[PDB]
Amino acid sequence: SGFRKMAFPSGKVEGCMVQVTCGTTTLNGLWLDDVVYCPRHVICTSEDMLNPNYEDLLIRKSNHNFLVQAGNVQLRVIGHSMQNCVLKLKVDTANPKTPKYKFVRIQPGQTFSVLACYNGSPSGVYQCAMRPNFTIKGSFLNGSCGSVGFNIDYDCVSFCYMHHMELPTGVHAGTDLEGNFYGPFVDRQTAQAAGTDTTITVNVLAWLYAAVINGDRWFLNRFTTTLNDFNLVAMKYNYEPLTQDHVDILGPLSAQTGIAVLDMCASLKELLQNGMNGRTILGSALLEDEFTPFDVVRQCS
Amino acid sequence: SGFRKMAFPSGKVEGCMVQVTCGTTTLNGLWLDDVVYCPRHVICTSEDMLNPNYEDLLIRKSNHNFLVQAGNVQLRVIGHSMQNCVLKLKVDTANPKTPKYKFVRIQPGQTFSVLACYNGSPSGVYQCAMRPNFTIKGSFLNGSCGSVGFNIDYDCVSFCYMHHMELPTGVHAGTDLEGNFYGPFVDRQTAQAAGTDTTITVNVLAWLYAAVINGDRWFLNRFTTTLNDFNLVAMKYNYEPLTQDHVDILGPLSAQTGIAVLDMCASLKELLQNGMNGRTILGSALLEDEFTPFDVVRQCS
Ligand SMILES: [Au+]
Ligand SMILES: [Au+]
Ligand SMILES: [Au+]
Ligand SMILES: [Au+]
């Protein structure tokens, strides 16, 4: 029993983290096979970050200016190229700890584990979700850029995030492992606002199911509702609109608990309209939306 | 910026997790050097658990009845002994992935990372605290016994917990790596109640400091208070009594923020007497008490 925000084991990714230094800046890189991936703004000075022309800045960089260090050993850079907002540094040694891996671009609402690193050394691991506005509410300090987010399914590490930026509002932005930013953000120190941060409705429902499975059931009411009618309440409270696809993905949890998806929606409705009256669900006094239905099934089996 | 409940990187401990089977039961063991540690109730049938005599049950067990498997390779058991509530299985092969490590018995209020495993394979990692009643609010399912809790300082893994039991109330009990249970619990399926679960006052104060560092400051009032007078409020709300030792440990956080410890206590006082009026602190609608002052400094530096 018990329900905790649980990250994936971090070992396979720890073995891939290296330190990358281009003149003054040092950040983290990801060493997979004989390529090191890192944020392209490693080539920038804190002066450059206001409006850098990365193509021009790269012209004055050669292989030997990129110092890559795994632990305490230097790797020899034999090639470099820019792909979108990441640099791919070709080294002469394949990482002997390369796991089976894929690069995946995740959708908003999906969750993943982040291994926060500084100067190529892991510091800690935690679970996050890609917000609907494409930001993440991370814990990152200077030098954490290049840290990656991932999922582990069986023996394959699915890399889905590389950390790039902290926006002025204290939230975080980054790219997939092909260097494309999530959302409208750019690797520039400027005014870049996040959109409205809606709540991930499907995850809230999944978490309510996890609560029922693990003993907390006070919030179960006698009501039911319809998709359209629930979505009117969702819209008012800035929740993602719930779709039939969402209903279907909740089916297994619906079967396990014997609570129809629309009955659970009516209970959520009441929670949104009436609050929690100082009580708690799974140790939280608010509605948690960073558990996917998959997360709930995996942790509950 | 940002503040997250962050576990230690799990890699060094993953390499130590094995599967241990004694007749029907299979649980997790910890393979360090040429010894495998596991809960002694591996030798029990679900029938035995009501009131087992472990000494007698062990008499009918020989080295070859304990099957220990790291990944997909068997380890050869050349000796076994019972120390308190753990078995120490001597094997003929030292674990090549043994990290630098220590066994530590932690005090209530201190935090650690748990690597939840099943059949010797890691499933996930999360951060917990040893409650003042010596229980932990974990996420454990059948077969998770033998999973361990640890801290990582530099290159040394400090093992502090091994999981044994789920009490009827859904909380968890276990031992240090010398096999001594935390609190009054025993490895028996019986009526074993947890005491009153008081809140870890010093951790709450540390977390409020983390909030100030990371932008949330609405809860800072104009008041101050005294230790004795605050402790009267703490007692009423079932908070740990705050001591001068606690004040001293908060000193570094007190210096970093410029908020005197007793001023922060007066703010907490108000939070306890008046609630949070629907607002939040670091994304929580309640007072978090599973961050130590050390946890806050490490994550904030
Ligand atoms: Au793969
Ligand atoms: Au950075
Ligand atoms: Au040590
Ligand atoms: Au068990």
From Swiss-Prot, chains A, B:
What reaction does this enzyme carry out catalytically? TSAVLQ-|-SGFRK-NH2 and SGVTFQ-|-GKFKK the two peptides corresponding to the two self-cleavage sites of the SARS 3C-like proteinase are the two most reactive peptide substrates. The enzyme exhibits a strong preference for substrates containing Gln at P1 position and Leu at P2 position
Q: What is the purpose of this protein?
A: Cleaves the C-terminus of replicase polyprotein at 11 sites. Recognizes substrates containing the core sequence [ILMVF]-Q-|-[SGACN]. Cleaves and inactivates human TRMT1, preventing tRNA guanine(26)-dimethylation of tRNAs. May cleave human NLRP1 in lung epithelial cells, thereby activating the NLRP1 inflammasome pathway. May cleave human GSDMD, triggering alternative GSDME-mediated epithelial cell death upon activation of the NLRP1 inflammasome, which may enhance the release interleukins 1B, 6, 16 and 18. Also able to bind an ADP-ribose-1''-phosphate (ADRP).
Cross-linked sites for Glycyl lysine isopeptide (Lys-Gly) (interchain with G-Cter in ubiquitin): 5, 90
- Membrane side Cytoplasmic: residue ranges: 1-301
The Peptidase C30 domain extends over 1-301
Extract the coiled-coil ranges from the record.
Answer: none
This protein's assembly is summarised as: 3CL-PRO exists as monomer and homodimer. Only the homodimer shows catalytic activity. Interacts with host FBXO22; this interaction promotes the proteasomal degradation of nsp5.
* Mechanisms controlling activity: Inhibited by pyridone-containing alpha-ketoamides compounds 13a and 13b. In turn, alpha-ketoamide 13b (tert-butyl (1-((S)-1-(((S)-4-(benzylamino)-3,4-dioxo-1-((S)-2-oxopyrrolidin-3-yl)butan-2-yl)amino)-3-cyclopropyl-1-oxopropan-2-yl)-2-oxo-1,2-dihydropyridin-3-yl)carbamate) inhibits SARS-CoV-2 replication in human lung cells. Inhibited ex vivo by michael acceptor inhibitor N3. Inhibited ex vivo by compound 11a and 11b.
Q: This chain belongs to which protein, by name?
A: 3C-like proteinase nsp5
Q: Where in the cell is it found?
A: Host cytoplasm; Host Golgi apparatus; Host nucleus
Q: What is the effect of changing residue 205 to V?
A: In strain: Zeta/P.2
Residue numbers annotated as active site: 41 (for 3cl-pro activity), 145 (for 3cl-pro activity)
